[PDB]
Amino acid sequence: IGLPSINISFKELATTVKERSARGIIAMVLKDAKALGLNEIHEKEDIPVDLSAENKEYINLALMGNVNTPNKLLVYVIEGEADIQTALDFLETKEFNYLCMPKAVEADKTAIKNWIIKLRDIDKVKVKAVLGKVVGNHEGIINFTTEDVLVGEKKYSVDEFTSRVAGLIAGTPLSQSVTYTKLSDVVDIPKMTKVDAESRVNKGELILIKEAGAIRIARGVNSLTELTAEKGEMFQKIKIVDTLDIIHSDIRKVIIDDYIGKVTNSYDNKCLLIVAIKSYLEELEKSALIESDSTVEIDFEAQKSYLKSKGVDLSYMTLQEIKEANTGSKVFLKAKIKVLDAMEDIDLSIEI
């Protein structure tokens, strides 16, 4: 065990590290001929030396967060001369929030766009991608369109700066928005007029602008542009969609872990499920992610419709009997919630 050790040493001050966020997982796809597979990165220093220097700078870009560093980076490496589908198929199994890939081409962006739309709409997993020049009409696609970003006398194209943007978004607390967040490391961007910035924001682009002070983000919008009755203006904001995705993931975890295939489909067990979901919503209300007075209940209209579609006769049948009627292996529920937006626009009229 050795002799007793009293080791008193001296050194000068060390640079402080920004604090870690409990939230926000980023997956980034890079290409290099060496050190393939999946690599999990926690701190900036832990980067495999086998990657080329350019990939090291990309990882370092994604490491910087807004208020906190992102919770975790998952790095998948492919040699090349192969489809990006090979990395997408593997990523279908992992758990993450945002996906970026600094090196891409138009068909490759098409693959990522279609893949994320597929995941969200068909596989019921809420994920998002930050892409350079993509005109997706979806809330799952964030279109960052800014050319030739200059950091420390360097040239960054639009597609390769999305690692910084993804780290920025993942590093932001849920109570805040990325609108007007300033990037101290950025020095220069191409000349841009306010009318053009207005037009691009209207078209659904996430852009940088030069304002009073440093460089900052203009507005926190998605790529969504087509608005219907089911999908209003709130679905265009990054912050709202982030909150909704967290709710979706947590409720899905509860349902799949505790109920699917575990309990008989009786009315008593349905009531127990309702109580569990309501308690989760109350927990959310206690943290001010959503407003107070949220509700969960049996969806009566949907159950009536299903019972009718099966040949049941709803004649002289009590509402209690309809509510408690056996519905095979299906459950029909509904709920109401409310989410608030951030302060972004202020009018002040001064009489003198």
């Binding site: 009531c271 127990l272 309702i274 109580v275 309501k278 308690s279 209690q320 509510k323």
Partner: protein, 140 residues
């Protein structure tokens, strides 16, 4: 429209505690007692009141067939960690108009019975509690 058969019988009661059915339940009670303070208004002979809040109080009685309460709270109480629970009570008399189901939440028990036995007497457990919230599922 009021008939004697419509009165709900307590034999048709059911109870879940911490998600588990309690087959040995004998009685269940839960009540909100309002805090009211007197206010005398100038010129008015009748004294009025102002509502300030409520205190939730209840109790459960069980036949002694197992060590349910011991396992629920005994070790945690001694260490200084107080657990909180959810109960669901259902009353569904087949001759009544409908069913009455209520969730009682944030339940904290008042004591713990380690042993209570007497020769020639069958065992029962009485467990009072307090609570702060509730939800209506299927009122009549």
């Amino acid at each position: 429209n009021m008939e004697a058969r419509n009165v709900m019988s307590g034999t048709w009661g059911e109870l879940w505690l911490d998600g588990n059915k309690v087959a040995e339940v004998k009685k269940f009670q839960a009540k909100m007692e309002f805090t009211k303070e007197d206010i005398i208004i100038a010129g008015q002979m009748g004294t009025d009141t102002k509502y300030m809040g409520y205190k939730g109080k209840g109790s459960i009685t069980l036949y002694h067939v197992s060590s349910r309460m011991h396992k629920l709270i005994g070790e945690k109480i001694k260490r200084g960690s107080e657990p909180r629970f959810v109960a669901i009570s259902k009353l569904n008399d087949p001759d009544s108009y409908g069913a009455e189901r209520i969730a009682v939440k944030n339940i904290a028990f008042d004591d713990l019975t380690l042993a209570d036995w007497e020769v020639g007497v069958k065992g029962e457990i009485e467990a009072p509690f307090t609570f702060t919230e509730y939800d209506f599922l299927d009122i009549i």
